[PDB]
Design a protein around this ligand. Sequence first.
Ligand SMILES: CC(=O)N1CCNC(=O)[C@H]1CC(=O)Nc1cccc(Cl)c1
Ligand SMILES: CC(=O)N1CCNC(=O)[C@H]1CC(=O)Nc1cccc(Cl)c1
Lengths: 286, 300
Amino acid sequence: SGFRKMAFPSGKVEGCMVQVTCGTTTLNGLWLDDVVYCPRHVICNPNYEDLLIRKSNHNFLVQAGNVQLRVIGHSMQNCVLKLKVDTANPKTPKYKFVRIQPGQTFSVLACYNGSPSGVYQCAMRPNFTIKGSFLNGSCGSVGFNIDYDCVSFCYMHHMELPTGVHAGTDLEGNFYGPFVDRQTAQAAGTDTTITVNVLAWLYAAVINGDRWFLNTTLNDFNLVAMKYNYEPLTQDHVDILGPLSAQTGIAVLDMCASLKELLQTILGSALLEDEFTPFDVVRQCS
Amino acid sequence: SGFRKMAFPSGKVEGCMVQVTCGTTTLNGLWLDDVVYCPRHVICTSEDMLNPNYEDLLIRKSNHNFLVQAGNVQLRVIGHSMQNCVLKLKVDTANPKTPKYKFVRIQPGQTFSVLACYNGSPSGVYQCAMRPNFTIKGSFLNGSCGSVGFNIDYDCVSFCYMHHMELPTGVHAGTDLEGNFYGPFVDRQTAQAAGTDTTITVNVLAWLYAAVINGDRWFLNRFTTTLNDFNLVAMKYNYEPLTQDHVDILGPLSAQTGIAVLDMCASLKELLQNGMNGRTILGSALLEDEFTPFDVVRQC
Ligand SMILES: CC(=O)N1CCNC(=O)[C@H]1CC(=O)Nc1cccc(Cl)c1
Ligand SMILES: CC(=O)N1CCNC(=O)[C@H]1CC(=O)Nc1cccc(Cl)c1
């Protein structure tokens, strides 16, 4: 029994974290094969082509624990700097670079100047920010999921927005959300609540004994959801919640009706949590 | 900025997780140097869940009765002994991945990270607090026995917890690595239940300091309070008594924010009195108590 904001074990990613210094900026890098990946703002209204063109390879200090790596080439892909080094990481996991959707979750290994300090579980918000926890020096920390010993890297941290939330890119350097790597007047848009994750979480509650909220149509549920700032529930979502209806014996629309009543504690919270995907609930409540 | 129930990186502990099988009972084990540690109830059968005699059960065992596996590798057991509720299996091979480590026993209100494992395979990591009633509100399924809890000082892992059982209320009970249970619990499957739990007062106060550090002061007021008046009120909300030791511990957070501990206590009294009024503190509508003053400083 029990239910927790549980992160993936982090050892496979810990073995890939290095420290990257350029000039007066130090941040984190991800060392896979013979390439270190880090935010391109390590070289800083900037002109990133001119900034990189004037850099030589010995202007990048890559410190892998107690061993300095020799940079033998530097390139750039979208917002990410790619540093080629003289040695391949012997600890490189089976990995792929993926890009995730809002509503999907991933684990974040917060590192500070190369050294992992803590791991936690996040969701990509509908406004493409993440409500994480990052202090100075945490730029370049990565987010990931693990599936049968393959690490799917989905996020690299770049910056904090003035509302205390965080913005970054995938590992190909493409930003999540309408953000740019300039220290300028940027702000998150109006957020919304992830309906399918709330419903999956309610399913976790009945699996773990909380049933006091149990009691519609998809069309009437969505009419109230739009007034409570909830994402519209699609049939894709309804089908995805199928396995939880099958395990708990509660139709998706019945759970929607219960959610409607709640909008008009569970699993230890006074708020309707929405950072657990249907997959997360099953993996943990198997 | 931001604030999460952040766990320690788990790689140093993942490299120590193994699978221990005795008869048809399988659980997880902790492999450090040439010793595998696991709950002693691995040697129980279906006939003696209720009143097992562990001394008698163990003397009937040979080393080859214990099947221990590190991934694909079977480890050779060359000896076995018992220390309280933990079984210690000596093996022919020392763990090449042994981190620097200590065995520690934590106090209630202290936090640690749990690496949840099944069949020696880690599946996830999360953050726990030792409740005043000596249980933890974890997330464990069948097969999770032997999973361990820990903290990391720098490169040294302090192991403080090994999981043994789930109580009828849903909470979880276990031992330190000496095999001594946290709380009045025994590794028998007779009816046991946790005592009345309470809220960890010093942790709520630390967390209110964290909220101030991250920019929120709306819950403060112009009042102060004596320590005893505070406890007289807080205990009516089922809070743990706040001791001068706790007040001393909150010192660094008080100095950092300029808010005296007892002034923050006065705020807590009002929050208990009034509620959130539709607001949140660090993203929660409840008063969180699973962050120690040391956790707050480290994350802030
Ligand atoms: C993470 C870290 O170690 N640091 C150094 C100290 N301060 C910081 O802000 C960061 C660097 C940073 O964010 N730079 C930047 C530059 C150009 C545009 C944008 Cl968006 C960001
Ligand atoms: C956790 C785990 O992996 N398993 C193996 C499969 N089945 C289980 O029951 C457990 C072991 C267990 O809890 N047994 C037990 C026996 C006597 C007293 C007490 Cl307290 C507990």
